[PDB]
Design an enzyme around this catalytic site. Structure first.
Site, PDB file in Angstrom:
ATOM      1  N   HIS A  27     -66.599   7.561 -30.317  1.00  0.00           N
ATOM      2  CA  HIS A  27     -67.564   7.864 -29.252  1.00  0.00           C
ATOM      3  C   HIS A  27     -66.918   8.355 -27.958  1.00  0.00           C
ATOM      4  O   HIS A  27     -67.448   9.255 -27.309  1.00  0.00           O
ATOM      5  CB  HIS A  27     -68.457   6.663 -28.939  1.00  0.00           C
ATOM      6  CG  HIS A  27     -69.624   6.519 -29.864  1.00  0.00           C
ATOM      7  ND1 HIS A  27     -70.447   7.575 -30.186  1.00  0.00           N
ATOM      8  CD2 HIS A  27     -70.106   5.447 -30.533  1.00  0.00           C
ATOM      9  CE1 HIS A  27     -71.401   7.156 -31.001  1.00  0.00           C
ATOM     10  NE2 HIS A  27     -71.217   5.869 -31.225  1.00  0.00           N
ATOM     11  N   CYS A  29     -75.638   4.105 -36.280  1.00  0.00           N
ATOM     12  CA  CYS A  29     -75.239   4.345 -34.894  1.00  0.00           C
ATOM     13  C   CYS A  29     -76.458   4.207 -34.009  1.00  0.00           C
ATOM     14  O   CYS A  29     -77.517   4.734 -34.343  1.00  0.00           O
ATOM     15  CB  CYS A  29     -74.665   5.755 -34.736  1.00  0.00           C
ATOM     16  SG  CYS A  29     -73.973   6.141 -33.089  1.00  0.00           S
ATOM     17  N   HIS A  44     -64.955   3.479 -34.829  1.00  0.00           N
ATOM     18  CA  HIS A  44     -66.276   4.021 -34.532  1.00  0.00           C
ATOM     19  C   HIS A  44     -66.483   4.173 -33.016  1.00  0.00           C
ATOM     20  O   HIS A  44     -66.902   5.228 -32.537  1.00  0.00           O
ATOM     21  CB  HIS A  44     -67.347   3.101 -35.117  1.00  0.00           C
ATOM     22  CG  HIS A  44     -68.747   3.579 -34.889  1.00  0.00           C
ATOM     23  ND1 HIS A  44     -69.529   4.102 -35.897  1.00  0.00           N
ATOM     24  CD2 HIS A  44     -69.510   3.601 -33.770  1.00  0.00           C
ATOM     25  CE1 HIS A  44     -70.713   4.424 -35.409  1.00  0.00           C
ATOM     26  NE2 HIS A  44     -70.724   4.136 -34.121  1.00  0.00           N
ATOM     27  N   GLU A  45     -66.162   3.124 -32.265  1.00  0.00           N
ATOM     28  CA  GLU A  45     -66.381   3.146 -30.812  1.00  0.00           C
ATOM     29  C   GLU A  45     -65.399   4.091 -30.118  1.00  0.00           C
ATOM     30  O   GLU A  45     -65.760   4.814 -29.186  1.00  0.00           O
ATOM     31  CB  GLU A  45     -66.296   1.738 -30.206  1.00  0.00           C
ATOM     32  CG  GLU A  45     -67.254   0.713 -30.828  1.00  0.00           C
ATOM     33  CD  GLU A  45     -68.667   1.244 -31.035  1.00  0.00           C
ATOM     34  OE1 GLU A  45     -69.114   2.104 -30.247  1.00  0.00           O
ATOM     35  OE2 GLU A  45     -69.323   0.800 -31.999  1.00  0.00           O
TER      36      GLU A  45
HETATM   37  C1  LIG Z   1     -76.150   3.143 -42.848  1.00  0.00           C
HETATM   38  N1  LIG Z   1     -75.741   1.821 -43.241  1.00  0.00           N
HETATM   39  C2  LIG Z   1     -76.113   0.747 -42.487  1.00  0.00           C
HETATM   40  O1  LIG Z   1     -76.800   0.771 -41.476  1.00  0.00           O
HETATM   41  C3  LIG Z   1     -75.626  -0.525 -43.003  1.00  0.00           C
HETATM   42  C4  LIG Z   1     -76.398  -1.191 -43.925  1.00  0.00           C
HETATM   43  C5  LIG Z   1     -75.944  -2.391 -44.411  1.00  0.00           C
HETATM   44  C6  LIG Z   1     -74.741  -2.896 -43.978  1.00  0.00           C
HETATM   45  C7  LIG Z   1     -73.984  -2.215 -43.052  1.00  0.00           C
HETATM   46  C8  LIG Z   1     -72.686  -2.786 -42.603  1.00  0.00           C
HETATM   47  C9  LIG Z   1     -74.427  -1.016 -42.551  1.00  0.00           C
HETATM   48  N2  LIG Z   1     -73.668  -0.302 -41.619  1.00  0.00           N
HETATM   49  C10 LIG Z   1     -73.507  -0.734 -40.301  1.00  0.00           C
HETATM   50  N3  LIG Z   1     -74.112  -1.862 -39.942  1.00  0.00           N
HETATM   51  C11 LIG Z   1     -73.928  -2.235 -38.678  1.00  0.00           C
HETATM   52  N4  LIG Z   1     -74.563  -3.409 -38.247  1.00  0.00           N
HETATM   53  C12 LIG Z   1     -74.946  -4.306 -39.309  1.00  0.00           C
HETATM   54  C13 LIG Z   1     -75.964  -5.263 -38.728  1.00  0.00           C
HETATM   55  N5  LIG Z   1     -75.402  -5.895 -37.547  1.00  0.00           N
HETATM   56  C14 LIG Z   1     -76.320  -6.837 -37.057  1.00  0.00           C
HETATM   57  C15 LIG Z   1     -77.674  -6.630 -37.183  1.00  0.00           C
HETATM   58  C16 LIG Z   1     -78.571  -7.557 -36.706  1.00  0.00           C
HETATM   59  C17 LIG Z   1     -78.123  -8.707 -36.102  1.00  0.00           C
HETATM   60  C18 LIG Z   1     -76.775  -8.927 -35.976  1.00  0.00           C
HETATM   61  C19 LIG Z   1     -75.888  -7.992 -36.451  1.00  0.00           C
HETATM   62 CL1  LIG Z   1     -74.205  -8.287 -36.284  1.00  0.00          CL
HETATM   63  C20 LIG Z   1     -75.005  -4.970 -36.506  1.00  0.00           C
HETATM   64  C21 LIG Z   1     -73.968  -4.023 -37.079  1.00  0.00           C
HETATM   65  N6  LIG Z   1     -73.194  -1.538 -37.805  1.00  0.00           N
HETATM   66  C22 LIG Z   1     -72.617  -0.420 -38.238  1.00  0.00           C
HETATM   67  N7  LIG Z   1     -71.844   0.337 -37.333  1.00  0.00           N
HETATM   68  C23 LIG Z   1     -70.885   1.152 -38.050  1.00  0.00           C
HETATM   69  S1  LIG Z   1     -69.235   0.845 -37.380  1.00  0.00           S
HETATM   70  C24 LIG Z   1     -69.914   0.070 -35.892  1.00  0.00           C
HETATM   71  C25 LIG Z   1     -71.240  -0.532 -36.326  1.00  0.00           C
HETATM   72  C26 LIG Z   1     -72.113  -0.590 -35.110  1.00  0.00           C
HETATM   73  O2  LIG Z   1     -72.127  -1.569 -34.380  1.00  0.00           O
HETATM   74  N8  LIG Z   1     -72.868   0.535 -34.892  1.00  0.00           N
HETATM   75  C27 LIG Z   1     -73.652   0.567 -33.680  1.00  0.00           C
HETATM   76  C28 LIG Z   1     -73.145   1.712 -32.862  1.00  0.00           C
HETATM   77  O3  LIG Z   1     -73.658   2.819 -32.889  1.00  0.00           O
HETATM   78  N9  LIG Z   1     -72.055   1.401 -32.093  1.00  0.00           N
HETATM   79  O4  LIG Z   1     -71.566   2.583 -31.484  1.00  0.00           O
HETATM   80  N10 LIG Z   1     -72.755   0.018 -39.493  1.00  0.00           N
HETATM   81 NI    NI Z   2     -72.169   4.485 -32.529  1.00  0.00          NI
END
Ligand SMILES: CNC(=O)c1cccc(C)c1Nc1nc(N2CCN(c3ccccc3Cl)CC2)nc(N2CSC[C@H]2C(=O)NCC(=O)NO)n1
Ligand code: NI
Length: 193
Positions: free
Chosen positions: A167, A120, A163-164
């Protein structure tokens, strides 16, 4: 206000706009937006989407100091409005939507969780565990024109939208991790990986 500052033409959302744990706004229930939307409410959704695009671009993310994201909610910008942006790339985009007053109107009995756990933007620490969510959801929302949309989501898309939406309801991902055994695989839990 946050919304006035952020919706200035010149403003680019970055990590300094994103509030973190400890800020009460993340534990507050966001207010519904009314229609028609103000220009600021529309610009805000577009700015949020631009942030997601920037955060997913290697060069821009490095330049702007951004953590990557596929979703963002207005309360993370200290704006207590029910507005979310989602941008999930295809394994050009699997899901791209700015959603006003999103609402889950139906969900599967089956649960799901990302095998890798969730991160997050508002959480500057690792919190291990399966974040238990609905496997599939039907989501109602309005677009910027006040037109209603009803979509069905599964897999990663389903997880991100939930998730969103959490929030805008003052809920954080770790609220849904099993307290005793964070990596329990309960009956009916689909692990995504
Ligand atoms: C704790 N685990 C992780 O961080 C993790 C590790 C490996 C793989 C995944 C899928 C993990 N979990 C994870 N990962 C992501 N990322 C993965 C990388 N992405 C990325 C990185 C670099 C360049 C391009 C991209 Cl696409 C962005 C989204 N978002 C979320 N969360 C959990 S559900 C929503 C999603 C998210 O966007 N979270 C951000 C947030 O706080 N939104 O409110 N959750
Ligand atoms: Ni979030």
């Amino acid at each position: 206000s946050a919304i006035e500052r952020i919706t200035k033409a010149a403003h680019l959302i970055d990590m300094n706009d994103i509030i973190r744990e400890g800020n009460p706004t993340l534990r507050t229930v966001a207010e519904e937006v009314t229609f028609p939307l103000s220009d600021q409410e529309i610009i805000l959704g577009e700015k949020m989407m631009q942030f997601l695009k920037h955060s997913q671009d290697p060069v821009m993310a490095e330049k702007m100091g951004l953590r990557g994201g596929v979703g963002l909610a207005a309360p993370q910008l200290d704006i207590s409005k029910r507005i979310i942006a989602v941008l999930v790339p295809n394994i050009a985009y699997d899901l791209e939507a700015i959603m006003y007053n999103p609402k889950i109107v139906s969900h599967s009995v089956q649960d799901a969780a990302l095998g890798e756990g969730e991160g997050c933007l508002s959480v500057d620490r690792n919190v291990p565990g399966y974040v238990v969510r609905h496997a599939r959801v039907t989501v109602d929302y309005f677009d910027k024109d006040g037109e209603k949309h009803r979509i069905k989501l599964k897999g990663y898309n389903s997880i991100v939208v939930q998730h969103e939406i959490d929030h805008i309801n003052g809920i954080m991902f770790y609220d849904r991790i099993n307290e005793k055994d964070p990596f329990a695989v309960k009956d009916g839990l689909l692990i995504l990986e």
